[PDB]
Structure 1
Amino acid sequence: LRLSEALKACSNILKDISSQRYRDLNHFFLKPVDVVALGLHDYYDVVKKAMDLSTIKTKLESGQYHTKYDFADDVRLMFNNCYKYNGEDSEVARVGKQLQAIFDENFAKVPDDES
């Protein structure tokens, strides 16, 4: 599975946002939400499709994203699930916003899909 130049750039961004350098922002997003471990009420009444950084990596590296936009859709899904479930004043949403801002700045530099 050889990725396009755009999706290789996406892989590098994903690695960067998932890295130890941002651990205080990303640790909440590394692995799937586990309703039992986290004590959550009503999570899947609010969130239709869960997403997290490990799943994004699996999907990217197994060829499930055809364009950089498919990849970005799942990054945004992950963040939006967090905001909508937890509320934007929650601690986790606040760090999410910081991580998303880093993602957005870097994703704007990814080349065209056909290059």
Structure 2
Amino acid sequence: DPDQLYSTLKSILQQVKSHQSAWPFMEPVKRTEAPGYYEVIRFPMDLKTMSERLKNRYYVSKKLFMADLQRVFTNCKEYNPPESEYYKCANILEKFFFSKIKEAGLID
């Protein structure tokens, strides 16, 4: 059961990371790219951090994994204009994400 979740989550995270719209979210947002970001966004999240958390056995439920990935998207949509490339990527990758969640049969 626990390594069952672990495997599923690792597979899903890896596919999200490989996706072509994942590039904005691969590492923590850099100050040099976004100077006042950490002044606007209280709970930053990215896919590198999510990989470490996964390896650190933090994702003991569906809901913890979903909340971190959802945070990636909602940060991006709070910070960035609606027609920005960053916003478009967020919605594209979110659709991909949900398709892989259904495909896995992942429930709480």
- The TM-score normalised by the length of structure 2 is 0.87
Query: SS at the partner of 2:83?
Result: coil
Which portions of structure 1, spanning 4 or more consecutive aligned residues, are displaced by more than 4 angstroms?
none
Quick check: 2:28–2:44 contact (8 Å CA) kept in 1?
A: yes
RMSD: 1.8
- The TM-score normalised by the length of structure 1 is 0.83
Quick check: 2:16–2:97 contact (8 Å CA) kept in 1?
A: yes
- Which structure 1 residue ranges, 5 or more long, are not aligned? none
Higher normalized contact order (CA 8 Å, seq sep 6+, divided by chain length): 1
Count of matched residue pairs: 107
Identity %: 26
- Aligned-residue offset at 1:34: 0.6
- Aligned-residue offset at 1:41: 4.1
Aligned partners of 2:36, 2:54: CA distance in 1, in Å? Answer: 29
Quick check: 1:6–1:112 contact (8 Å CA) kept in 2?
A: no
Aligned partners of 1:66, 1:84: CA distance in 2, in Å? Answer: 28
